[PDB]
């Protein structure tokens, strides 16, 4: 399934592992073509190494909205469900 | 640069919003929680959005709904339609002064009702018949269909109401008639003006509903009342959601407009 | 009814079967809802399912409009609602002789084929008396700015009264082929009544002032009748 | 197909645009699943409304590294070809 | 967190490089240009990196190919295997010393050796025979399939040597040994300890890969150098490449190597 | 029958002229006994052309992939092993019981200074070495009058001395043409031939120098181990001296090597 994750303000580390596997078509933006074990190790190490920063990851899925995606770190907006639509909420400005 | 719609077929059909605002805030179609949360719905993308009752919508998001082309229904009982708003009227008189001239004729519109029947019903209506006389087979068939149908889903049938069952088809229809006056709307037509159905607010999408109501939309109710769920309506708007995006209906549902008017012989308007 | 209202910076609600507004204020007015045949909502208006509702019930239409009305952005009924009406002015158009009848009416309260010419002739003119009045340069058409502020401002509020009749703004007669011909062949009757003066006077100012024309005039509440006069030289019954 | 577009410093405009027909997943983050035509109208707005901004368009597709990727503004990298496999490359920072 | 080398299924199977200096900067694996261009390579996507002459490698990027599992191989001509690099031997001495066993033992070897024959042949070879025997029956089944691929395609055949047909046969048996160099190591066996060819650097891996050799990999090589193409050695590669990707080959190689050493029945080691 | 291995950081390397040079920053160019060495050890910010890769290879000298002065081993050349002769050699050692009591017997014989005590077990044997150990690590501060509590800045700069020292080791297991995985003192572990192996040379002049470090204080003691341990293993030949310990300590099966 095609990935792409988005990072913000994430320690070297981090970025440094995420081009192991990934493509950096921009600094911070990763693309790649992964499994489901594959995409799941790579959140893991989102989870672990990223701490100041914004983190988000988005995957091509066979769902009515056809793509699923989760965030961490501060700020995150939340991934919600309409209906079997998927959306996204965050906070008052 | 220019915003353009983007084709009603590119969209999902529809979304329905049960409580909270909608609103425009920092540049996004936005649905407000009691609450305060804010749920980012990407208008342009969507079809219908059905509005049910204890929803607030704003002057912004009106405003944004119709640059975007996508109509809003103020929906109520079993999804019946309440309001809609949009572009006010078609912006090419050519459009609707040729649906006029079809709908004002009477053997222009005799051309138009046969075409009808023909797309409904599989074949050609019997010849000689007056409009009020088509309508009349018409509606014998549809009673027959409506009677099949509750033989093959074991539901109990004391006849249609316009009782599980009716509650079913009228919620399947409404999203059917939703979709319809979204795609006549889009196409540039009067949903006022009809051929069949005449006097009545949105004549013209009951004509086009109707013509392909029957396939899955219609026979879909019945599957569902025979289940007899606690919530039909939830479960129905679901599988319509799901017929129209597999029959590609709002696909369809432009060629079979412009087809059906076609059919009077005058020459449409240019693309 | 033919009456217009404004209704601006609010929330909408019904109480007790009541239509109300709420000012950012928390003082709440009442709005006779009934009474008015539409409801133009300036920006900052925010409109409850019930508000929605009981507009519908009562057959007042909702038309979303830019501050004093100087564009519509969206109408409820998108299409129109009442189908008699809208077949009713097809008719018309289609028809040439009919069509004549029409178009013959809209000269004639002009003032008071060849005479699409004259009208222009007739207009070219009372520019020149206006820029007179108000001892204005004129070059024909800061002044044109005004102009077409004024006007802008009008076409609006006309386009709004002519979905409120339940007619199509886009069949005109004078003027045809754009999507506003029939906007501009009511409001050019009037245009020079109030709002074009008014225009001179001045040379956001404009708009400002076409709003104070509008409520102190109560030119809203003339529009709709003057759109089915001029229908109703097509001497064919009316819906 | 799914489509991922990465705005930087780009004008309000483009940003009020890309949220009419895809999801902001982030703040200049927007992800949807449209058609080609539909990503061709997308990438479009971006040519004509990023400003000195910096934009990637990402979306997949049926190729042997499974997505396509164009870029557009400042300090872009460019998507290049390696015996059929997509790649990326780019000028060193300073 | 401790950083895990990707399964070899889950990956690009291989990628040559013709020129340029491979190297880590920025915290990026990259090819860099004779411009300056920098090329971003994931190196953890991809099983097998190819170096064509021509190429400089830095201590960085030898170094974190070796830690993210992918095999760095140097070429030459013809794709030939020169040189390669990775981590250093194998983690599991039980592994290592459970291949060693089934080496030595002249009654286990054997027992591998027919497994092997029954893989590549589809039925057993006949009994009591030796190692040198079963190699020898081996030898002539593969001549005999050599002439018969040649006829099949209309390629001129005089023999094979170890002249389009054995340059493309060469090159697509070396994708093959270099994927099957890079498996073997991934499952943490030598690729020196074989059962057939023996006493070669890399006897294990000839041995594996020459059981699937003619499924599809060697027929292609008769397919390709009929058409007779300008640029041989790409066609051929890209080919390969197709063929690992859809026979899903590196999926298929570590259960094969298991497979093939059960054979002694000799208990094999634990899994994690 | 070549046994050297030698160092190279900070350089460019490639074959001019058919011949093994590194060109440094300065540009200046060095020749390179490649075919007189075992093993040659790369340091961070080496860059290898595939001209000396294949030269290398052609005269059988393995390029091992290592940390400044030795510290980590990241890569080796020919990884799982070049030469099947010398592996097998090993595993047969490790596999049979009498030949594996015959090298451990060896080791301890090494690690003492005069063989073990025949009548004494395994176990026992690991065990007298641990007290003996402990000693020496005392023995050694009290000498250098080092404060002592066991294995402070001492433990830094003698982890600092060892691991040089076992990546050296590493280098040299592989470039004999075994497998670090196989021991027969320690096992179990990935580098227990190189434990095996170190842990007999350790304190004959690494450790001994991380206790002479350690009479500084520094702060920063690692690079001023390492450099020493490098100065040890570039002025004693102590690298020359560490695969022919490799191969003595495998004779000891008896059996007759390659």
């Known amino acids: 399934s095609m990935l792409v994750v988005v990072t913000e303000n994430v320690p070297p580390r981090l970025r440094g ?77 | 640069l220019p915003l353009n719609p983007i084709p009603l077929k590119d969209r999902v059909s529809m979304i329905f919003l049960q409580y909270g605002q909608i609103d425009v805030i920092d540049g996004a179609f936005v649905l407000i929680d009691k609450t305060g949360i804010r749920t980012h719905i990407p208008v342009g993308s969507v079809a219908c959005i059905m509005l049910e009752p204890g929803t607030r919508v704003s002057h912004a998001a ?84 409506y009677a099949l149908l509750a033989k093959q889903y074991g539901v109990t049938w004391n006849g249609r109401r316009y009782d599980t069952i009716n509650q079913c088809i009228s919620a399947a229809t409404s999203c059917l008639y939703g979709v319809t006056e979204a795609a006549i709307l889009a196409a540039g037509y009067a949903p006022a003006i009809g051929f069949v159905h005449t006097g009545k607010p949105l004549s013209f999408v009951y004509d086009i509903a109707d013509i392909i109501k029957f396939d899955t939309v219609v026979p879909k109710a019945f599957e569902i009342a025979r289940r007899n769920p606690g919530e039909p309506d939830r479960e129905v708007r679901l599988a319509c959601r799901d017929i129209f995006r597999s029959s590609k209906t709002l696909a369809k549902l432009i060629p079979l407009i412009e087809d059906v008017l076609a059919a009077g012989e005058i020459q449409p308007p240019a693309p």
Not at chain 1, 20 to 35: C, F, H, N, P, T
Not at chain 1, 47 to 68: K, R
Not at chain 2, 92 to 107: F, I, T
């Open chain 1, 17 to 93: 592992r995420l081009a192991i596997w990934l493509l950096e078509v921009r600094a911070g933006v990763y693309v790649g073509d992964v499994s489901a074990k594959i995409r799941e190790m790579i959140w893991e190490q989102i989870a672990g190494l990223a701490e100041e920063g914004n983190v988000v990851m988005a995957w091509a899925t066979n769902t009515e909205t056809g793509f699923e995606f989760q965030t961490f770190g501060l700020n995150r907006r939340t991934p919600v469900d309409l209906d079997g639509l998927r959306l996204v909420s965050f906070l008052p400005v």
């Open chain 2, 62 to 145: 009106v405003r944004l709904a119709a640059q975007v082309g996508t109509l809003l229904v103020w929906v109520g009982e079993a999804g019946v339609r309440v309001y809609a708003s949009g572009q006010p009227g078609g912006a090419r008189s050519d459009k609707l002064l040729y649906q006029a001239k079809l709908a004002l004729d009477e053997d222009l519109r005799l051309k138009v009702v046969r075409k009808m029947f023909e797309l409904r019903f599989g074949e050609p209506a019997p010849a000689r018949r007056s409009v009020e006389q088509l309508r009349g087979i018409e509606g014998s068939r549809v009673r027959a269909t």
